[PDB]
Design an enzyme around this catalytic site. Structure first.
Site, short mmCIF file in Angstrom:
data_model
loop_
_atom_site.label_atom_id
_atom_site.label_comp_id
_atom_site.label_asym_id
_atom_site.label_seq_id
_atom_site.Cartn_x
_atom_site.Cartn_y
_atom_site.Cartn_z
N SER A 157 0.61 -1.07 -0.13
CA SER A 157 -0.12 -0.04 0.09
C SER A 157 0.83 1.26 0.08
O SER A 157 1.32 1.33 1.08
CB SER A 157 -0.94 0.09 1.23
OG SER A 157 -1.73 1.38 1.35
N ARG A 158 1.22 1.83 -1.16
CA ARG A 158 2.15 2.83 -1.41
C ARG A 158 1.79 4.13 -0.56
O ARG A 158 2.60 4.84 -0.26
CB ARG A 158 2.29 2.92 -2.89
CG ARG A 158 3.10 2.46 -3.58
CD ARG A 158 3.18 2.63 -4.78
NE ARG A 158 3.43 1.23 -5.67
CZ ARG A 158 2.67 0.94 -6.67
NH1 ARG A 158 1.93 1.83 -7.14
NH2 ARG A 158 3.25 -0.04 -7.22
N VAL A 159 0.62 4.42 -0.06
CA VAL A 159 0.21 5.29 0.80
C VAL A 159 0.61 5.08 2.03
O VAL A 159 0.88 5.99 2.84
CB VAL A 159 -1.45 5.55 0.61
CG1 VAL A 159 -1.63 6.63 1.62
CG2 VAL A 159 -1.90 5.83 -0.72
#
Lengths: 268, 55, 128
Positions: free
Chosen positions: C119-121
């Protein structure tokens, strides 16, 4: 399904097949070497045990020390597993023995089953042909850190290389300083009562006959690795042929499909 | 050599001498295998116990 | 779902699955005789998804701070994440949750491939 996936699966198989077909030959490189140290070993058995044969040396019945021999190196059929068998089989008739393991594969074979018993463990072993220097120091540490010379019985366990094609896990006794004295026909010999010949001969024998087991167990293993890799690289070869058909089909359906895809792209 | 080593060590100590004073010309491939070892040892209780010293 | 985002509220939309949508779009186009591309798909079966998935946003304060969060679903044939559509959508999204039968049948549930999944966030989207 994908040519990439099939390409990788064909490579890791053929690679395995180099690994095993070379260990098969690195074994045969070592195969002649194995018979040198094997007959030389059985030769000193005839020389050094004939004393004990003649002295009628037997176990004083007045707590055992069991010494198992294999190696740190695996991939040798059931060298490790069926010696562990014969040692367990023996551990039923006397459960309370101390275990000293020489080699990492017999260590963990036996650590699985009787982890309380193992009380010293020798490493970095299978790599070369066995030597007296190794033996003697492992022997020295057996006397020192293990108090070997206080045991009612001492046992060595190794695999005896019966043939080039099969092997047999066997067991042999080591008699201590006291046990050598109270042998029936010990008197037949004019041992000079001055030096404790019984002490030194025990220490010398303990080292000497560990090396004989080591040299023999070593040899049988080489043959097990020769035979196991004989089978492995033949299975691997069989896999290769199959997968070479599957590669070649996927090779083609990948060319076909790209072309149909292109040809369709101009249907208009 | 009492309160100390053993007959076989006491014999290996002298056994190196013969090998390591045989002219290099034929100190052979197998001959050096005999003059050094890689062995280590680890004592045990209940699972492992004390340190893993060299030999 | 955008109505919620556009009025200080927060929606969560789930596209189950986008693979089937892509199949529908290819059918239209082939029957409209629009010329096909890779794997008989329309020439812009990326734009289809990219325009859709850009609509999931987090609006500024000047806009009421509402949000559309998207969870698109894609289905792979034999785990082939190298395929056309699964790749297209991997590129669009802010991260991926990979699910594997190999792990699923080993008892691990959800079958989340911890190595590939991101989850790059990231830890900015997670309770302290």
């Amino acid at each position: 399904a994908t040519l990439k996936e099939v390409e990788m699966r064909l490579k890791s198989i053929k690679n395995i097949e180099k690994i095993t077909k070379t260990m098969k030959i690195v074994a045969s490189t070592r195969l002649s070497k194995a018979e040198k140290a094997k007959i030389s070993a059985k030769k000193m058995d005839e020389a050094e045990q004939l004393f004990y044969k003649n002295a009628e040396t037997k176990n004083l019945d007045v707590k055992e020390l069991i010494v198992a021999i294999t190696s740190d190196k695996g991939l040798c059929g059931s060298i490790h597993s069926q010696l562990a068998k014969a040692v367990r089989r023996h551990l039923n008739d006397q459960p309370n023995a101390d275990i000293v393991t020489i080699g990492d594969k017999i260590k963990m074979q036996l650590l699985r089953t009787h982890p309380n018993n193992i009380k010293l463990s020798i490493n970095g072993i299978g790599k070369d042909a066995p030597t007296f220097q190794e033996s003697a120091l492992i022997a020295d540490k057996l006397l020192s850190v293990m108090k070997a010379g206080t045991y009612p019985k001492i046992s060595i366990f190794y695999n005896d290389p019966v043939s080039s094609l099969s092997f047999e896990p066997s067991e042999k006794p080591i008699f201590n300083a006291k046990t050598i004295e109270q042998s029936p026909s010990f008197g037949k010999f004019e041992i000079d009562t001055d030096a404790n010949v019984p002490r030194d001969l025990f220490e010398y024998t303990l080292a000497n006959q560990m090396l004989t087991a080591m040299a023999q167990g070593y040899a049988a293993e080489i043959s097990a690795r020769r035979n196991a890799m004989d089978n492995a690289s033949k299975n691997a070869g069989d896999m290769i042929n199959r997968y070479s058909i599957l590669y070649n089909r996927t090779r083609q359906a990948v060319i076909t499909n790209e072309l149909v895809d292109i040809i369709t792209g101009a249907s208009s | 050599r009492k309160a100390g080593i053993s007959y076989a060590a006491y014999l290996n100590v002298a056994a190196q001498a013969i090998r390591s004073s045989l002219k290099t010309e034929l100190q052979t491939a197998s001959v050096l295998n005999r003059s050094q070892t890689d062995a280590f040892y680890t004592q045990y209780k209940n699972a492992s116990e004390p340190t893993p010293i060299t030999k | 779902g955008e109505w919620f985002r556009d009025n200080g509220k927060h929606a969560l939309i789930v596209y189950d699955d986008l693979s089937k949508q892509a199949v529908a779009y290819r059918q239209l186009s082939l029957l409209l005789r629009r010329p096909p591309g890779r794997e008989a798909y329309p020439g812009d079966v990326f734009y289809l998804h990219s325009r859709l998935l850009e609509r999931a946003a987090k609006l500024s304060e000047k806009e009421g701070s509402g949000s559309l969060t998207a969870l698109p679903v894609i289905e792979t044939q034999g785990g082939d994440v190298s395929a056309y559509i699964p790749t297209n959508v991997i590129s669009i999204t802010d991260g991926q949750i990979f699910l594997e039968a190999e792990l699923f049948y080993k008892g691990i549930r959800p079958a989340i491939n911890v190595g590939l999944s991101v989850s790059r966030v990231g830890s900015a989207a997670q309770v302290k």
